[PDB]
Amino acid sequence: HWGYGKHNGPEHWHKDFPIAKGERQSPVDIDTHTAKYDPSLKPLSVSYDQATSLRILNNGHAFNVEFDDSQDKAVLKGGPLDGTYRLIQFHFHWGSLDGQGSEHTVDKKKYAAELHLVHWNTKYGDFGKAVQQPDGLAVLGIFLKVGSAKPGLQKVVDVLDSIKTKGKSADFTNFDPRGLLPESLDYWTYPGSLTTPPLLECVTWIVLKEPISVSSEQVLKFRKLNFNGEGEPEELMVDNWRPAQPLKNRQIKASFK
Numbered sequence: 678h679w680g681y682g683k684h685n686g687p688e689h690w691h692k693d694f695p696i697a698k699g700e701r702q703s704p705v706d707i708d709t710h711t712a713k714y715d716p717s718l719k720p721l722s723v724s725y726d727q728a729t730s731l732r733i734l735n736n737g738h739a740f741n742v743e744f745d746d747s748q749d750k751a752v753l754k755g756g757p758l759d760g761t762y763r764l765i766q767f768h769f770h771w772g773s774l775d776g777q778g779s780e781h782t783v784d785k786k787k788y789a790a791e792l793h794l795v796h797w798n799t800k801y802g803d804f805g806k807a808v809q810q811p812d813g814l815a816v817l818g819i820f821l822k823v824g825s826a827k828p829g830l831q832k833v834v835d836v837l838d839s840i841k842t843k844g845k846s847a848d849f850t851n852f853d854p855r856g857l858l859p860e861s862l863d864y865w866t867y868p869g870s871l872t873t874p875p876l877l878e879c880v881t882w883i884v885l886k887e888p889i890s891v892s893s894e895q896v897l898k899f900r901k902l903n904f905n906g907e908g909e910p911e912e913l914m915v916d917n918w919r920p921a922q923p924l925k926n927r928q929i930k931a932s933f934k
């Protein structure tokens with residue numbers, strides 16, 4: 678099926694999912710000089726105090742940490758959003774080397790990785806229904822660069838050897854996502870899509886200006902995961918990012934400067 682190789686990678690996706698060439702595809706390059714400052718934009722409200730993580734899964738494309746989204750426990754609101762979005766999962770995209778890995782770029786710069794905290798609009802009642810709507814999702818993107826460790830990521834890094842191959846999962850309770858956030862909530866925002874198949878155009882993207890730092894050892898452990906299932910040939914899970922897509926007729930707004 679779809680994946681990230683020469684033969685099933687991003688350049689192939691449009692054959693099974695024609696929306697790949699659509700008008701509001703993600704990710705995009707964030708041109709920080711042409712982003713429009715909007716003093717009308719509200720601060721983001723990230724309300725993660727009551728987050729309930731449940732499990733961590735290797736789905737053959739990335740690893741997801743899934744949260745209980747059956748009540749308003751971990752929510753995103755404000756910023757550019759009308760109404761309230763519940764956290765369902767986070768995952769990352771990363772590279773084979775530190776010089777690449779992010780999906781969004783900032784003035785053409787790729788970061789080592791990119792975290793996506795995926796949230797769905799409470800008015801659609803669940804994730805499966807929200808993705809069918811143009812305002813269905815709000816995904817908070819946070820760039821990772823390599824430097825000092827992010828202590829709040831380590832619980833994640835340490836479980837990865839238990840989910841090495843496609844389809845493995847592990848219980849993953851009491852993980853606090855607030856420990857993945859940088860200090861500033863200044864953001865760019867634009868309307869876009871899932872960055873993987875089905876590439877649905879349902880996402881309000883909220884990309885934080887400030888990257889978090891992770892250690893080289895932390896990202897190296899992302900790279901030891903596998904795309905393949907246990908007992909198929911080993912393909913390291915690296916370079917699971919989609920390149921920047923044409924902005925077409927969208928403007929990126931900034932909450933700052």
Ligand SMILES: COc1ncnc(NCc2ccc(S(N)(=O)=O)cc2)c1[N+](=O)[O-]
Pocket residue numbers: 741765766793795804805816870871872873874
């Ligand atoms: C009800 O379960 C689910 N059902 C179907 N798709 C899901 N997730 C697809 C997805 C793909 C890409 C991105 S991205 N890379 O744009 O952030 C975000 C979510 C989930 N789910 O994981 O919540």
Ligand SMILES: [Zn+2]
Pocket residue numbers: 768769770793872
């Ligand atoms: Zn993603």
